Amino acid sequence: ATFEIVNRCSYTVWAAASKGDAALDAGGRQLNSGESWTINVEPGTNGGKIWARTDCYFDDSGSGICKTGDCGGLLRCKRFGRPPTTLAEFSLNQYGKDYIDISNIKGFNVPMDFSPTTRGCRGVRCAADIVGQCPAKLKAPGGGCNDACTVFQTSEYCCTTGKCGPTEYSRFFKRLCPDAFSYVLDKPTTVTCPGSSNYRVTFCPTA
Q: How far is CA 129 from CA 66, 111, 132, in A?
A: 21, 8, 6
Cβ-contact 125, 131 below 8 angstroms:
no
Q: Which of 92, 132, 124, 91 is nearest to 108 (CA)?
A: 132
Q: How far is CA 58 from CA 22, 24, 66, 169, 207, in A?
A: 20, 19, 9, 34, 29
Distance CA 207, CA 205 (A): 7
Distance CA 195, CA 183 (A): 27
Q: Which residues contact 63 (CB under 8 A, 6 or more apart)?
A: 73, 74, 75
Q: Which phi and psi (to 5°) does residue 158 adopt? A: -95, -15
Q: Which residues contact 36 (CB under 8 A, 6 or more apart)?
A: 4, 5, 6, 7
Q: Which of 102, 65, 104 is nearest to 84 (CA)?
A: 104
Distance CA 199, CA 3 (A): 5
Resolution reached, in Å? 2.3
Greatest Cα pair distance in the chain? 46
Q: Which residue segment(s) compose the domain that 74 sits in?
A: 1-207
Using only the alpha carbons of the chain, give its radius of gyration.
16
Full DSSP string of the chain: -EEEEEE-SSS-EEEEEE-SSSEEEEEEEEE-TT-EEEEE--TT--SEEEEEEEEEEE-TTSBEEEEES-STTBSS--SPPPSS--EEEEEEEETTEEEEEEE-TT-BSS-EEEEESSSS---EEE-S-HHHH--GGGB-TTSSB--HHHHH--HHHHT-SS-----HHHHHHHHH-TTSB-STTSPP-PEEEETT--EEEEES---
Distance CA 185, CA 181 (A): 8
* Long-range pairs for 97-100: beta carbons < 8 A, 24 or more residues apart: 97/192, 97/193, 97/194, 97/195, 98/1, 98/192, 98/193, 98/194, 98/195, 98/196, 98/197, 99/190, 99/191, 99/192, 99/193, 100/124, 100/190, 100/191, 100/193, 100/199
- Other beta carbons less than 10 A from residue 124's beta carbon: 21
Number of domains the chain is built from: 1
Cβ-contact 88, 113 below 8 angstroms:
no
- Other beta carbons less than 10 A from residue 187's beta carbon: 8
What CATH number is given to the structural domain containing 203? Answer: 2.60.110.10
Q: Which of 31, 35, 202 is nearest to 111 (CA)?
A: 202
Q: Which phi and psi (to 5°) does residue 107 adopt? A: 95, -165
Amino acid letter at 178? P
